[PDB]
Amino acid sequence: ILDKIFYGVLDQGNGWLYVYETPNQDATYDSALELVGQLNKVVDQLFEKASVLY
């Protein structure tokens, strides 16, 4: 399971093995984290730039 070729669950409290062959969730949310990531740094930069007013 840790390796990951069948990734399922073992029941100690009974005695079944459930198999899940479900690969992976949304690329969409993932690439959205990157865009937000850039933007956080960018606004601070701009603010640095914008300090001639002060």
Binding site: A27, T28, S31, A32, E34, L35, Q38, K41, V42, L46
Partner: peptide
Amino acid sequence: KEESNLAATKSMVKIAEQYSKRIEEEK
């Protein structure tokens, strides 16, 4: 349709670096 929404986000990452660089000083 998902493909297009996804793509745009990636698209804009690559050009946000040059924009990021551009406004570092620029005074």
